[PDB]
């Protein structure tokens, strides 16, 4: 079925560097869009980033500028979101999803739109923690 | 209305084609027009605002350096390396100096040696493009006749806004009573975007062509970022240092910033605050006006006694506004306005109120008009006769159909053959005159473009010389063309 | 840039009422706009697309409505299970963007 | 560096006045100029020059003028 | 601006390398011929100019070079 | 000429003839400077303002 | 004008006036003929190692 299975939650120090990983199940992997986005609990949602599986292409919201990495594994049909100088604001939890996807290279607007971003199948969250 | 004041202004005199006129308006200018009927009316263009951009450049105009390791093999053999340069976030230079048994190690040479840096850079240029489509104009058309405050304060409600974007045409426009109007516009035949660059700096922005967008030098950075920090170029930024002899040495370059001021020089600006500001450029509109009533049909003329305030006001060529106000009773009368020769009627001004008329009565209403180049006689009183009140305009025939070339050239300056369109319905001769300058300015201005005051003005004489000494009579498709082409659009142009 | 203000923060109602929220655009949307329902621990969830259209799968209760700038989701009637937060979300330009979320309370 | 390449001929203009507004113009020539007074020898050397070659009285003209315009 | 006067010939040049040492020529040369390759049409017309005037062959070329250095 | 941190030596004459805000050795609190009107430079857009 | 308000209808004369401040500077200076001297190391050959 549709679904998303990111990686367990984990705790950094300060200045560090995470990785979460995000695997889909239950489609062709490069005929959706990623994204990712992220919830402080005291906050709302917020929009890291997005990569394609197909081809590679990404971008990147203006606050992560610089910080933040993303790449995929086709083979395991996978993702991989990276964020870099982690500090304590940065402690949340991540999400990750998808798009309907027409076709080469990522970001749309015209053509339609997702009609969604992280809240049908963007899986099921996973905890970051920035501390000493 | 709203175009008093303004100086350089266009009267458009007829209509004809049982409909339609051809009006090219832009910006600082503005437009007044007029038929053997209806109302005349007033274009006014403001701010021209397009919506969605998209973001291609990223130049920085100022960076810093730090870490910056360096190396040589000090041989002859190898050429030195370094693992840093892998990353090309840094830049690399390869240099030569020497080395021997001062440098202690190899063989007595002059030695192949490197370097890198990290490059971080601390400001930017933003620039984007839009596409030729959702881009808008905004017009204000407002109508003469009355009702008081300003022939001016463009500011306060009459000609609406009458927005309007290529997604939609025709252009329907309503104003009280007859205010049915019905415009066309041709956007794409407007500045020519898809050459166009939006370029905001720290504030300020400019418009400028692509190409030389393209082509500035200073670094390289892709519209798609995102941490890339992985920025082309930089060998014109950041200089290195090689003394003498001994070592080498790099250098931030140091912020440009007003050099590319003096670089985007020649180019109307633009400011940019949210999401568009978008003045000058000009716009091609073409109105049918049949939908007009006078505003106002079958009345009585006025009743007598009006009682003016001030005086004449000219302004540029004419149009002698005056205000008055109407005193008695007859509600909204006709005014029984008048310019007349000495004595002896052989009664002649041009009105453009046309038909004034008294609103709720007490307001301030108001007229223009144009009296001969002479003495005039200007009268509004009728029972008792009212009024008189003397006038005499200065100039004005010879030196106006003179100061009319002018406008003329000008406008076949500046704005190009839209210009020639710029007329209404010329039948045949006007439009060939279109299509003539068209093809042929447009491979004889342009190709010989991108050039400035002086090389323009200096190969104008030298060219108009050649001609000079030249045979066959050909001369004159060499001088009369050549001489007025170059000089005339020389002093004009680069405003 | 385009800054998406949520109306109310929060509400607070008896089971079977209507309730209605309002999200306003600092620039004109169009028809792009969403609203999410999330409950607490869990990952947001679909409401609304396009602004005007339910999925398939949800209730049919929901609905939303608004065009240029200005929005408002609406339950037709409260069912305690409902309570979450929600959310509007605007997918223009692409800096993409959320509205900061409004509680329900149940009475 | 955008020292020199200060989008001017191009195109595109308008109806408004743009930048530097009636001065870059005369700003080139009074910096020539004054480079001219500065180094009155190039001058007087180019001129001679402009006396030699061709001369054509017309030529030495434009070539004098041309090597006025030759300092950077 | 400063933009130009670049206090180049000047004189008191030393042993050592000064400042962009191997550059600002090349820069000069490459810049200017970007601005030939953007603008072809006032390349020819110079050129006829050159076929024109004076023509006595070496001439021409000499006015020619003008062209190049007409402006930036 | 000493800059923010490195100098140059020029010969004098084009270090006078240099544009850009002038000010004498004496200054201190003067503020006096004599030029600017190679620096900031004015807007006049189509009518209106300055 | 009436827009503006006042008088009859003409091109007017207006003015303006800044506060002028600056930032970073240049220090240049000059030195005479004096207050100025060379260092030389004047080597012998002949061994030793270093
Ligand atoms: C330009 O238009 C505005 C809007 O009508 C004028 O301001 C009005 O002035 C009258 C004069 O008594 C007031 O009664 C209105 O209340 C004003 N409108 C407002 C305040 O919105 C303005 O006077 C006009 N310009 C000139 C020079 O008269
Ligand atoms: C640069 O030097 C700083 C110390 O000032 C160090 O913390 C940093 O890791 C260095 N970066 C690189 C890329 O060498």
């Known amino acids: 079925e549709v679904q998303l299975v990111q990686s367990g939650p984990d705790v950094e120090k300060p200045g560090a560097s995470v990785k979460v990983s995000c695997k889909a199940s239950g489609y062709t992997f490069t005929s959706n869009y990623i994204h990712w986005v992220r919830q402080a609990p005291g906050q709302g949602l917020e929009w890291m980033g997005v990569i394609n599986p197909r081809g590679g292409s990404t971008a990147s919201a203006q606050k992560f500028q610089g910080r933040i990495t993303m790449t995929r594994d086709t083979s395991t049909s996978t993702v991989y979101m990276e964020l870099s100088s982690l500090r304590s604001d940065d402690t949340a939890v991540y999400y990750c999803?998808?798009?309907?996807?027409?076709?080469?290279?990522?970001?749309?607007?015209?053509?339609?739109?997702?009609?969604?971003?992280?809240?049908?199948?963007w899986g099921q969250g996973s905890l970051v923690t920035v501390s000493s | 209305m709203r175009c008093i004041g303004i100086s350089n202004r266009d009267f458009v005199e007829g209509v004809s084609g049982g409909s339609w006129v051809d009006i090219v308006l832009e910006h600082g200018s503005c437009v007044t027009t007029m038929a053997k009927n209806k109302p005349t009316l007033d274009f006014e263009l403001i701010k021209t605002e397009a919506k969605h951009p998209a973001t291609l450049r990223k130049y920085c105009v100022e960076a810093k350096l730090t870490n910056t390791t360096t190396a040589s093999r000090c041989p002859t053999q190898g050429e030195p390396s370094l693992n840093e340069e892998q990353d090309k976030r840094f830049v690399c230079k390869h240099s030569m100096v020497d080395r021997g048994w001062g440098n202690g190690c190899g063989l007595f040479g002059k030695g192949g040696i490197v370097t890198c840096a990290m490059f971080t850079c601390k400001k930017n240029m933003e620039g984007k493009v839009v596409q030729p489509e959702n881009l808008e104009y905004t017009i204000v058309i407002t109508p003469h006749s009355g009702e008081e405050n300003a022939v001016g304060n463009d500011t306060g409600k009459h000609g609406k806004e009458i927005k309007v974007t290529p997604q939609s045409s025709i252009t329907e426009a309503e104003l009280t009573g007859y205010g049915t109007v019905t415009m066309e516009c041709s956007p794409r035949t407007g500045l020519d975007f898809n050459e166009m660059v939006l370029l905001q700096m720290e504030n300020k922005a400019w418009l400028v062509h692509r190409q030389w967008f393209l082509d500035l030098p200073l670094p390289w950075l892709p519209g798609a970022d995102t941490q890339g920090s992985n920025w082309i170029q930089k060998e014109t930024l950041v200089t290195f240092k090689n003394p003498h002899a001994k070592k080498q040495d790099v250098v931030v370059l140091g912020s440009q910033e007003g050099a590319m001021h003096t670089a985007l020089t020649g180019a109307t600006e633009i400011q940019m605050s949210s999401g568009n500001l978008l003045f000058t450029g000009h716009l091609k509109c073409r109105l049918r006006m049949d939908k007009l009533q006078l505003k106002g049909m079958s009345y009585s003329m006025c009743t007598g006694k009006f009682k003016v305030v001030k005086e004449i006001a000219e302004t540029q060529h004419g149009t002698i506004v005056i205000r008055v106000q109407y005193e008695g009773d007859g509600s909204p009368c006709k005014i029984p306005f008048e310019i007349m020769d000495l004595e002896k009627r052989h009664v002649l001004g041009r009105l453009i109120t046309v038909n004034p008329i008294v609103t709720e009565k007490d307001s301030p209403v108001n007229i223009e008009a144009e009296p001969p180049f002479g003495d005039s006689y200007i009268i509004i009183g009728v029972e008792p006769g009212q009024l008189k009140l003397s006038w005499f305009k200065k100039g004005s025939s010879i030196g106006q159909m003179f100061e009319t070339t002018m406008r003329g050239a000008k406008r076949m300056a500046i704005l190009g053959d839209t210009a020639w369109d710029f007329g209404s319905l010329g039948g045949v001769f006007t439009s060939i005159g279109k299509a003539l300058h068209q093809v042929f300015g447009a491979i004889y201005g342009a190709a010989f473009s991108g050039v400035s005051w002086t090389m323009k003005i200096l190969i104008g004489v030298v060219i108009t010389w050649i001609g000079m000494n030249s045979r066959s009579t050909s001369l004159s498709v060499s001088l009369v063309l050549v001489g007025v082409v170059t000089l005339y659009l020389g002093v004009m142009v680069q405003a | 840039d385009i800054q998406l203000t949520q109306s109310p923060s929060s509400l607070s109602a008896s089971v079977g009422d209507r309730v209605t929220f309002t999200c306003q655009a600092s620039?004109?949307?169009?028809?792009?706009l969403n609203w999410y329902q999330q409950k607490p621990g869990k990952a947001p969830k679909l409401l609304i697309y396009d602004a005007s259209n339910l999925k398939t799968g949800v209730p049919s209760r929901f609905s939303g409505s608004g065009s240029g700038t200005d929005f408002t989701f609406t339950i037709s009637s409260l069912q305690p299970e409902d309570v979450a937060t929600y959310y509007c979300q605007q997918f223009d330009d692409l800096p993409i963007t959320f509205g900061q979320g409004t509680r329900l309370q149940i009475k | 560096s955008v020292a020199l390449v200060p989008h001017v001929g191009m195109g595109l203009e308008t109806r408004t006045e743009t930048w530097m507004s009636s001065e870059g113009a005369w700003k080139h020539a009074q910096r020539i100029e004054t480079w001219i007074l500065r180094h009155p020898g190039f001058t007087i050397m180019a001129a001679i020059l402009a006396y030699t070659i061709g001369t054509t009285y017309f030529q030495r003209v434009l070539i004098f003028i041309l090597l006025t315009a030759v300092t950077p | 601006s400063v933009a130009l006067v670049p206090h180049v010939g000047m004189g008191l040049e030393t042993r050592t390398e000064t400042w962009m040492s191997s550059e600002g020529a090349w820069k000069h040369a490459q810049r200017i011929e970007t601005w030939i390759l953007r603008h072809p049409g006032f390349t020819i017309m110079a050129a006829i100019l050159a076929y024109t005037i004076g023509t006595t062959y070496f001439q021409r070329v000499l006015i020619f070079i003008l062209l190049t250095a007409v402006t930036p | 000429l000493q800059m923010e941190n490195k100098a140059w030596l020029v010969h004098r004459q084009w270090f006078l003839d240099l544009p850009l805000p002038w000010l004498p050795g004496a200054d201190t609190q003067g503020s006096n400077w004599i030029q600017k009107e190679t620096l900031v430079t004015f807007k006049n857009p189509h009518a209106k303002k300055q | 004008g009436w827009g503006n308000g006042c008088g009859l209808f003409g091109k007017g004369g207006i003015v303006t006036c800044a506060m002028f401040t600056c930032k970073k500077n240049m220090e240049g200076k000059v030195v005479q003929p004096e207050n100025l001297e060379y260092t030389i190391v004047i080597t012998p050959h002949s061994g030793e190692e270093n």
């Open positions: 620039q004109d949307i169009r028809k792009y």
């Open positions: 999803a998808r798009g309907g996807r027409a076709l080469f290279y990522d970001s749309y607007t015209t053509p339609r739109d997702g009609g969604s971003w992280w809240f049908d199948p």
